[PDB]
């Protein structure tokens, strides 16, 4: 299609400030019941549609991960993905930057941006990932 496929994921989860400020993940807190979640049309706990935007911590912690040697079609292998827990008590699934056989559970990691896959036009989709701090 000459109307392009996406090159970014996703404006309601990963905030890239237009003035060049550091990107951050964001959640949305239900104003009725207080549930924090990623962006959704209605609160899955109480069905309210009234929210407040909550910027999320850029530091998280690898809860678990796996080195992927046989993965999705079209992604370069090996790659790594993980459950990354944020201190706001939200869990984010994301790729980890780096080499196989180097991550451990409960390791601290920091948000970063990079290509997570190629789109239908064979151009990279840029999204959030996490990387080692030191």
């Amino acid at each position: 299609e000459k109307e392009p496929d996406i090159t970014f994921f996703h404006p309601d989860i990963l905030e890239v400030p237009k003035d060049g400020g550091l990107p951050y993940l964001k959640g949305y807190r239900c104003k009725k019941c207080g549930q924090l979640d990623f962006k959704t049309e209605m609160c899955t706990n109480c069905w309210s549609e009234e929210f407040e935007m909550v910027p999320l911590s850029r530091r998280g912690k690898v809860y678990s991960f796996s080195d992927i040697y046989i993965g999705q079609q079209g992604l370069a292998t090996p790659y790594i993905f993980a459950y990354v827990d944020l201190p706001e008590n939200l869990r984010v699934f994301a790729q980890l930057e780096g080499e196989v056989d180097t991550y451990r559970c409960d390791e601290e990691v920091e948000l970063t941006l990079g290509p997570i896959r190629m789109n239908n036009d064979n151009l990279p989709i840029i999204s959030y990932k996490f990387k080692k701090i030191a």
Partner: protein
């Protein structure tokens, strides 16, 4: 689901599992015919409803199964069911509900699938890019691998411990003609098989297979009228859907397996320590290991000890995967949940020859899940509790 009246299983049916060159309808019909003949049915239209589970063969699989038995028509309402790997168990569940509620007195559930005859892209076994974890590269083996890594982190389990699940399940299947892979395999062969997503190697993953099974269920009075010698009582059966949220979970647990099994124990009045055999969703070695804890066979954190102590094989508290599991049969999506029930019935009846559990089991439990979009552990879970229903 509470049963409004007693429901019993009469005849069951089961094809060989593996690579078949006959399709899902032929396999399903073979299993249905066996189950009907094993129920001493002389008038096929005594069967008042049929449910058939399938994953991706077609939209009219149950009608395609029964048409070759001459049974389609105004006296056989057929509904096909789907919940990925839950489907075959849900088919039996629907039949049980028809009988328990008095909608019918005799019903049949079939689960059937043929994968290997058909070109299935690979995208059919996965969710769409729309699913957030899939957008970021998730594959099922890596999702379960993360569960294994977390379990090794918490318990000190090694890859060799995980591989012993394949070893055990293939051992159980040694003399089972229905199973596909069977017999002795060494831990080093399992561990040294190709790495898919650490620590899951190829031999720790169930494979795609073709097969079918069927279960006839009926009222107490129907068991007497059919002259069924060893009717198996449905002590309980439970269907759940998986909770969705984005909070940290303990993935060495399993929210829906925990709640489904607890509800099954409460409704049936049978606790987990009373279960003598168990068929469960061993799509990967780590799943069976975690489910020892998730189902309450042992305490939190004790699944590794349970395995190493031999508590999940012959002589132990509960023989887990006595037919060989998905790790020996492979996994025809629509079939497995019905097939677990067929083999548990055969074990309760003492009919499994060289793979028969001794002493004879009296309580048999079965479990399949299925699916799992982002934020869920699984989409569905279906569990059955079956007990000996004949006297002395």
């Amino acid at each position: 689901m509470k049963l409004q009246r007693e429901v019993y299983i009469a005849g069951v049916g089961e094809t060989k599992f593996g690579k078949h060159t006959v399709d899902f309808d032929v396999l399903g019909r073979e299993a249905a015919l066996q189950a009907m003949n094993g129920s001493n049915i002389d008038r096929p239209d005594m069967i008042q409803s049929a449910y058939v589970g399938n994953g991706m063969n077609d939209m009219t699989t149950g009608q395609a199964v029964f048409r070759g038995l001459g049974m389609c028509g105004p006296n056989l309402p057929i509904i096909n069911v789907q919940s990925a790997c839950s489907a075959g168990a849900m088919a039996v569940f629907c039949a049980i509900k028809d009988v328990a509620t008095g909608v019918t007195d005799l019903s049949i559930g079939v689960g059937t699938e043929n994968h290997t005859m058909h070109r299935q892209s690979g995208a059919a076994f996965s969710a769409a890019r729309s699913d957030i974890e899939t957008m970021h590269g998730a594959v099922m083996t890596g999702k379960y691998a993360m569960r294994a890594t977390r379990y090794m982190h918490e318990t000190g389990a090694t890859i060799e411990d995980l591989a012993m699940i394949t070893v055990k399940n293939r051992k159980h299947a040694t003399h089972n003609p229905y199973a596909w892979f069977k017999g002795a395999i060494t831990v080093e062969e399992v561990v040294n098989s190709r790495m898919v997503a650490y620590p899951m190697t190829l031999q720790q993953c169930c494979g795609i297979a073709d097969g079918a099974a069927a279960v006839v269920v009926g009222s107490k009075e129907m068991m007497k009228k059919l002259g069924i010698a060893k009717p198996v009582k449905v002590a309980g059966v439970v269907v759940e859907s998986g909770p969705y949220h984005n909070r940290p979970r303990d993935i060495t647990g399993d929210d829906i397996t925990e709640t489904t099994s607890e509800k099954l124990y409460e409704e049936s009045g049978i606790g987990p320590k009373e279960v003598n055999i168990l068929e469960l969703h061993d799509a990967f070695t780590i799943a069976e290991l975690l489910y020892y804890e998730c189902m309450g066979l042992c305490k939190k954190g004790d699944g590794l000890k349970f395995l190493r102590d031999g508590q999940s094989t012959y002589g132990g508290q509960c023989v887990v995967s006595p037919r060989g599991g998905l790790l020996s049969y492979g996994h025809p999506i629509g079939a497995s949940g019905a097939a677990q029930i067929a083999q548990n019935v055969k074990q309760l009846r003492g009919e499994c020859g060289g793979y028969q559990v001794g002493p004879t089991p009296k309580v048999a439990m079965s479990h399949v899940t299925g699916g799992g979009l982002s934020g869920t552990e699984h989409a569905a879970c279906t569990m059955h509790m079956l007990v000996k229903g004949w006297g002395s």
